[PDB]
Ligand binder design. Structure first.
Ligand code: JSO
Lengths: 242, 264, 99, 183
């Protein structure tokens, strides 16, 4: 079984838009739940359903509605997007009211009063220091995603057009370029560390890939800059001796 | 100094004729109904006014959602059993869960299931095991015994939660559940056939329903005929015991709520 | 499958006396399955305005019910309880024994 | 269905042991749960206690004291992959799932051969990298708001069975040196 399937993973909305978060489970579970997770507090129940044909309010139901006309699906509707609804949403299911919850992969949601605040990341790869390669026989590439809003990005490293994990560390949380401002654009760093030998091989191609979540191609745009749509922004380095 | 109990029953019926709920659940404290829910109302409601006055609307609303959940689970449980036995047509599934609080302060808890009104599965909360009546019950017993966390959930609920609920409910209904109405006990002489005399000891107006009645000589009597403890329909019970005399050959003994009576 | 036919007891709330306002009780018990029809009769005809308890559950998985009515006994008036159930190929009439 | 408390953050060394405490106040109780939640991931079920005592599954144990209103989640032989939030939750008498604010667990790598340097990377056409320092070093961000500094990140180069701390700093200021940039 798939477990709990929740979509989308990311969403930006303007103040006043409505939105449906989809959630399905193929586990024949009676209980489905919607939670929001906000910094510095416990998961908060929005709505739950004890079975198909019934739903009930959680602790923070205001601004949302749900339906459960099937065992499988428990859609959450945001009635009229408000900034206070900027959060991470998790769909869950359990067999019974006392059994362990199975969680969806979550929906990171940002509401802004103005879509002109949305920006795709600029992405740059910084080759390794000759001093590091000399003193450690190791080489650390740094990737820098800057100027993006909202904080909806997935950073991946590709070598020779194939994703890698070993030797990678990515900041778990983006930095604010302007800590004061409330719609501050974000910056995210990552390292890929490899042997000096691997970096010296001119047959090795390195690629930092930042999947950005922004506007739809369908969204209206009356600004001179390119419409800041969902898009992959990349930068690249080739290995070499010198 | 008497025993109290809390019990929740569940009745599921497959393919009910149009005028019969597919599902009913009723709670009792002693012989009093406290709570009702069915598949027609889809509402949990109080059946005693002292439950109504003491539990805010949020209780009924919450347990309404829980009972909709358990109604669905029951329906799937029955369907599955009917698959296992390969039974078509209408069949019943039943469950009783509850606990006793005795005078010494000691407790009991139980959980059993019935298919077509016969013992199917009985829970042992000490050995954390299920007694299965046949091969089909053994199959459900193995699935249930493989979920250790659920057995422990169930043990705790019977021993802690059930007893906490009972005490809360006893306090709510104290004027009803903890009162005494003593029996009015008469002794009738009836000639049942010519020459042959039989004595009837009759009791009524009594609560609780628990009562002991026997006939003694000068030594208990043999062949005592017992009437059931029956409800009078005003919250009190009636009951009787008869003996038949021997040619040329006695007292009625009643014990109720810590009071002993003799009628010679 | 084991069906249980109802036990049917008819009796008064109080020692009955002719001309003394009482209650006639019909207690139907130990039946399975749950589907049942009960009528109180007065000289063979159906008494309207009868009251009954909810279907009630016993720990042996059988069911019980109390049907009762306000009445005043006489020497002449006959009273009965008529119960139908899947176990009964015809409704069963049980008459009030008149203490 | 009243209250539940667990520490905001704990820090322990790779290979060592950590005990995450959770206290709760309630009249009525149907069990206490621990969930594991990795950064950007779903919470996943770890443990369920309802009776008093201790349950053990590999490196994880969960204890419950009913009279103390107290549970702990015990992690032995800590690995970097145990770096996560651990969520305490219990069921009240009405099966309401009451959630702790969660404990962020930070694991420090055991750096056997600390070799702390700051290095300047070839820019793309300036980035600085503080690397190979011991896990007891805290990277503070500077006051200067034209200079950005990341938290320490732990990378695991399985290619050389090697682990290393690093933090990155950057700026566009023509007056900005990597040396002495990390305080
Ligand atoms: C109405 C009600 C409330 N609580 C219950 N608890 C258990 N365990 N089982 C039931 O059927 C209940 N019904």
């Amino acid at each position: 079984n798939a477990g709990v399937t929740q979509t989308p993973k990311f969403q930006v909305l303007k103040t006043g838009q409505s939105m449906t978060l989809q959630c399905a489970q193929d586990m024949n579970h009676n209980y489905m739940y919607w939670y929001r997770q906000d910094p510095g507090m416990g998961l908060r129940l929005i709505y739950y359903s004890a079975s198909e044909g019934t739903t009930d309010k959680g602790e923070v139901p205001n601004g949302y509605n749900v339906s459960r006309s099937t065992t499988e699906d428990f859609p959450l509707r945001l009635l009229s997007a408000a900034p206070s609804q900027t959060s991470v949403y998790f769909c869950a299911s359990s067999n019974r009211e006392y059994s362990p919850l199975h969680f969806g992969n979550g929906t990171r949601l940002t509401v802004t009063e103005d879509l002109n605040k949305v920006f795709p990341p600029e992405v740059a790869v910084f080759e390794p220091s000759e001093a590091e390669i000399s003193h450690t026989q190791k080489a650390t590439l740094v990737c820098l995603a800057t100027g993006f809003y909202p904080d909806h990005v997935e950073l991946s490293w590709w070598v020779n057009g194939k994703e890698v994990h070993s030797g990678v560390c990515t900041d778990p949380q983006p930095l604010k370029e302007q800590p004061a401002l409330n719609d501050s654009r974000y910056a995210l760093s990552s390292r890929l560390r490899v042997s000096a030998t691997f970096w010296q091989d001119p047959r090795n191609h390195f690629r930092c890939q930042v999947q950005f979540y922004g506007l739809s191609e369908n969204d209206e745009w009356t600004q001179d800059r390119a419409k800041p749509v969902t898009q992959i922004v990349s930068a690249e380095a080739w290995g070499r001796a010198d | 100094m008497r025993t109290h109990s809390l019990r929740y029953f569940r009745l599921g019926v497959s393919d009910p004729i149009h005028g019969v709920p597919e599902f009913i659940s009723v709670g009792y404290v002693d012989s009093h109904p406290i709570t009702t829910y069915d598949s027609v109302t889809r509402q949990k409601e109080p059946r005693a006014p002292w439950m109504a006055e003491n539990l805010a609307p949020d209780h009924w609303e919450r347990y309404t959602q829980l009972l909709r959940g358990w109604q669905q689970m029951f329906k799937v449980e029955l369907k599955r059993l009917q698959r296992h036995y390969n039974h078509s047509g209408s069949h019943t599934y039943q469950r009783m869960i509850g606990c006793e609080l005795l005078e010494d302060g000691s407790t009991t808890g139980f959980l059993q299931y019935a298919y077509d009104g016969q013992d199917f599965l009985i829970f042992n909360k000490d050995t954390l095991s299920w007694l299965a009546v046949d091969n089909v019950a053994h199959t459900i017993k193995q699935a249930w015994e493989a979920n250790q966390h659920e057995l422990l959930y169930q043990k705790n609920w019977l021993e802690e939660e059930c007893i906490a609920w009972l005490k809360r409910f006893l306090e709510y209904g104290k004027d009803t559940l903890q009162r005494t109405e003593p029996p009015l006990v008469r002794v009738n002489r009836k000639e049942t056939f010519p020459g042959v005399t039989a004595l009837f000891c009759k009791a009524h107006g009594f609560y609780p329903p628990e009562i002991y009645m026997t006939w003694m000589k000068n030594e208990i009597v043999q062949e005592i005929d017992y009437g059931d403890i029956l409800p009078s329909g005003d919250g009190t019970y009636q009951a009787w015991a008869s003996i038949e005399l021997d040619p040329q050959s006695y007292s009625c003994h009643v014990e109720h709520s810590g009071v002993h009576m003799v009628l010679q | 499958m084991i069906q249980r036919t109802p036990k049917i007891q008819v009796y008064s709330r109080h020692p009955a006396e002719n001309g003394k306002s009482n209650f006639l009780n019909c207690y139907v018990s130990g039946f399975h399955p749950s589907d049942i029809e009960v009528d109180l009769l007065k000289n063979g005809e159906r008494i309207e305005k009868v009251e009954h308890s909810d279907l009630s559950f016993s720990k042996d998985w059988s069911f019980y019910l109390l049907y009762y009515t306000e009445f005043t006994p006489t020497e002449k008036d006959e009273y009965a309880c008529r119960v139908n159930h899947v176990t009964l190929s015809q409704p069963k009439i049980v008459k009030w024994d008149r203490d | 269905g009243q209250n539940i408390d667990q520490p905001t953050e704990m820090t322990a060394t790779e290979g060592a042991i950590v005990q995450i405490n959770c206290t709760y106040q309630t009249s009525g109780f149907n069990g206490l749960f621990w969930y594991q939640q990795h950064a950007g991931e779903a919470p996943t079920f770890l443990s369920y206690n309802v009776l008093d005592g201790l349950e053990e599954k590999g490196r994880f144990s969960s204890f419950l004291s009913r009279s103390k209103g107290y549970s702990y989640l015990l992690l032995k032989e800590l690995q970097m992959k145990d770096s996560a939030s651990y969520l305490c939750a219990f069921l009240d008498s009405n099966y309401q799932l009451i959630w702790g604010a969660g404990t962020k667990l930070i694991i420090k790598p055991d750096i056997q051969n600390p070799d702390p340097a700051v290095y300047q990377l070839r820019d793309s056409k300036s980035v600085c990298l503080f690397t190979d320092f011991d896990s007891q070093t805290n990277v503070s961000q500077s006051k200067d708001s034209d200079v950005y500094i990341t938290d320490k990140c732990v990378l695991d180069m399985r290619s050389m069975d090697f682990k290393s701390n690093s933090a990155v700093a950057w700026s566009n200021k023509s007056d900005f040196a990597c040396a002495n940039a990390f305080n």
